[PDB]
Amino acid sequence: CTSYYTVKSGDICYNIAQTYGIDVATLQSYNPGLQCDNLQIGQQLCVAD
Amino acid sequence: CTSYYTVKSGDICYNIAQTYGIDVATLQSYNPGLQCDNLQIGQQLCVAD
């Protein structure tokens, strides 16, 4: 992982992904076992590789 | 809380508490509500105080 995004209050996977120019599946591929229904505040999500 | 840890692919609550010295019981007392199968990738765990 080159780069991380930190979950903040009310963030959803779709928008986090759009912010980085990727789609949710790619975000998922970057984060083994990601659970978009269940993101935690401060959770760090890879957004690069 | 004094110190933190960021969950990576596959981490189980046992290896984590071990790595940082401590017992799972102690880990779970630093983290109110904690499903040790269900650890979110990139979740912030407390490991001290």
XYZ file of C-alpha atoms in Angstrom:
98
model
C 0.000 0.000 0.000
C 1.311 3.384 -1.224
C -1.562 5.515 0.111
C -4.324 5.480 2.752
C -7.685 7.098 3.358
C -9.020 7.424 6.899
C -12.696 6.740 7.439
C -14.579 9.680 8.896
C -18.074 9.953 10.223
C -20.685 9.145 7.522
C -18.231 8.052 4.818
C -19.367 5.281 2.453
C -17.291 3.084 0.219
C -18.805 4.404 -3.011
C -17.754 7.961 -2.290
C -14.326 7.104 -0.936
C -13.679 5.201 -4.120
C -14.944 8.019 -6.372
C -12.682 10.416 -4.502
C -9.676 8.291 -5.611
C -10.936 7.677 -9.205
C -11.630 3.960 -8.534
C -14.716 1.840 -8.069
C -15.785 -0.062 -4.996
C -14.542 -3.435 -6.284
C -11.083 -1.975 -6.740
C -11.220 -0.471 -3.268
C -12.198 -3.996 -2.118
C -9.394 -5.622 -4.043
C -7.019 -3.195 -2.263
C -8.423 -4.111 1.133
C -8.748 -7.921 1.673
C -12.006 -8.584 3.555
C -13.316 -4.956 3.528
C -16.906 -4.711 4.769
C -18.528 -1.654 3.292
C -21.660 -2.158 5.473
C -19.495 -1.815 8.520
C -16.800 0.787 8.232
C -15.250 2.044 11.480
C -14.212 5.615 12.273
C -10.429 5.970 11.779
C -10.302 2.728 9.792
C -7.474 3.115 7.269
C -8.184 2.017 3.807
C -5.669 1.390 1.149
C -6.360 3.427 -1.929
C -3.177 2.615 -3.903
C -1.736 -0.559 -5.675
C -5.645 4.710 25.627
C -1.845 5.328 25.220
C -0.899 3.354 22.070
C -2.639 2.013 18.904
C -2.435 -0.709 16.261
C -3.784 -1.010 12.744
C -5.302 -4.345 11.720
C -3.772 -5.918 8.581
C -4.975 -8.943 6.445
C -5.543 -12.014 8.680
C -4.674 -10.630 12.105
C -6.462 -12.496 14.918
C -6.930 -10.968 18.342
C -4.392 -13.534 19.810
C -1.345 -12.717 17.725
C -2.120 -9.015 18.206
C -2.254 -9.079 22.058
C 0.770 -11.408 22.068
C 2.862 -9.150 19.823
C 2.102 -6.267 22.260
C 2.787 -8.450 25.377
C -0.779 -8.679 26.678
C -3.792 -11.043 27.059
C -6.939 -10.978 24.877
C -9.057 -10.199 28.001
C -6.791 -7.150 28.419
C -7.097 -6.264 24.698
C -10.881 -6.457 24.876
C -10.856 -4.206 27.962
C -8.995 -1.513 25.971
C -11.590 -1.868 23.141
C -15.270 -1.785 24.274
C -17.069 -4.135 21.785
C -14.747 -6.296 19.695
C -15.594 -9.284 17.446
C -12.248 -11.059 17.178
C -13.233 -13.075 14.073
C -14.825 -9.862 12.653
C -11.868 -7.491 12.744
C -12.124 -4.758 10.191
C -9.138 -4.363 7.926
C -7.404 -1.080 8.927
C -9.333 -0.860 12.227
C -7.640 1.033 15.022
C -7.079 -1.204 18.097
C -5.965 0.214 21.418
C -2.998 -1.705 22.889
C -2.178 0.365 26.080
C -3.518 1.898 29.319
